[PDB]
From a paper:
We report here that surface‐expressed β protein of GBS binds to human CEACAM1 and CEACAM5 receptors. Human CEACAMs are a family of 12 cellular receptors belonging to the immunoglobulin (Ig) superfamily (IgSF) that are commonly expressed on epithelial cells, endothelial cells and leucocytes (Gray‐Owen & Blumberg, 2006). β protein is a multifunctional protein and interacts with several proteins of the human immune system, including factor H, Siglec‐5, Siglec‐7, Siglec‐14 and IgA, through distinct domains. A crystal structure of the complex showed that an IgSF domain in β represents a novel Ig‐fold subtype called IgI3, in which unique features allow binding to CEACAM1.
We solved the structure in complex with CEACAM1‐N at a resolution of 3.25 Å. The asymmetric unit contains two molecules of the (β‐IgSF)‐(CEACAM1‐N) complex, which are similar to each other when superimposed (r.m.s.d 0.20 Å). The β‐IgSF domain has two β‐sheets labelled ABED and A′GFC, with sheets connected by the BC, EF, CD and AA′ loops. The unique features of this domain are (a) the absence of cysteine residues, (b) absence of C′ and C′′ strands and (c) a truncated C strand that is directly followed by a 1.5‐turn α‐helix. Specifically, L46 in the α‐helix of β‐IgI3 interacts by van der Waals forces with F29 and L95 (distances 3.34 Å and 3.59 Å) located in the C and G strands of CEACAM1, respectively. In addition, the protruding β‐IgI3 residue V53 is within close contact of I91 (distance 3.36 Å, F strand), Q44 (distance 2.50 Å, C to C’ loop) and S32 (distance 3.41 Å, C strand) of CEACAM1, D55 is within close contact of Y34 (distance 3.50 Å, C strand) and G41 (distance 2.90 Å, C to C’ loop) of CEACAM1, and F42 is in close contact of L95 (distance 2.87 Å, G strand) of CEACAM1. No conformational changes were observed in CEACAM1 upon binding of β‐IgI3. For CEACAM1‐N, the crystal structure of the complex indicated that β‐IgI3 interacts with the dimer interface, contacting several residues which are important for CEACAM1 homodimerisation and for binding to other bacterial adhesins. In contrast, β‐IgI3 interacts through the small α helix and loop, with a single residue, L46, critical for β‐IgI3 to fit into a pocket on CEACAM1‐N formed by F29 and I91.
Numbering used by the authors:
A (entry chain A): 0 to 107
B (entry chain D): 7 to 109
């Protein structure tokens, strides 16, 4: 069940919200981090959430409209142009075998 | 039945400097590792810090080089690693990381 990332909508009006859904959260997962872009780059982390600690720590890419949910779903509010593009999600697991899985959305 | 070992037993490192170590856990029946403790201690916010090269992964002979990026000054702990197999055997083997300044 390979971790997938439908965005709702795909094509988002400026000022409207978009919600990145996640469909196959594994078991024995320690947490999720969202990144802006295609690769999992530290400099470009949106936010992480450890489920045990149940604590989400904004990364350097956070704009304070994201509200990450415990089901790994994101939700970016009041979107504008620079949001457009890809968003890798990584899920790190107890045994340190991780799962990248990227989604998209385009703003008009 | 289960072996579990951690390369440099009691590690020490200067702040800013990184930490290498290699976890090695082998046994009859599929062995998997548990870094629950290593993660909560050194990756409390989820982040790309900690690389984990599984040099010869295998079903039964799991070896992994972990690399904890850019230790901060207040990150000294003893950390308990774990290995579990199919029959239902667990193994806790602990190890220490300790960090300091240079000037």
């Amino acid at each position: 069940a390979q971790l997938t990332t439908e965005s709702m909508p795909f094509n988002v009006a400026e000022g409207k919200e978009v919600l990145l859904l996640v469909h196959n959260l594994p078991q024995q997962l320690f947490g999720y981090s969202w990144y802006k872009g295609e690769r999992v780059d530290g400099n470009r982390q949106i936010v992480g959430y450890a489920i045990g600690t149940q604590q989400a720590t904004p990364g350097p890419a956070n704009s304070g409209r994201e509200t990450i949910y415990p089901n790994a779903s994101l939700l970016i509010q009041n979107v504008t142009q620079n949001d457009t593009g890809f968003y890798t999600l990584q899920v790190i697991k107890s045994d340190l075998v991780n799962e990248e899985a990227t989604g998209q959305f385009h703003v008009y | 039945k289960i072996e579990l070992t951690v390369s440099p037993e009691n590690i020490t490192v200067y702040e800013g400097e990184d930490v290498k170590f290699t976890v090695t856990a082998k046994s009859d029946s599929k062995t998997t590792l548990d870094f629950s403790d290593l993660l909560t201690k050194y990756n409390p916010s989820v982040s790309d810090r900690i690389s984990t090269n599984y040099k010869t992964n295998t079903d039964n002979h799991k070896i992994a080089e972990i690399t904890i990026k850019n230790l901060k000054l207040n990150e000294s702990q003893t950390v308990t690693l774990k290995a579990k197999d199919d029959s239902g055997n667990v193994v806790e083997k602990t190890f220490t990381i300790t960090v300091q300044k240079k000037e």
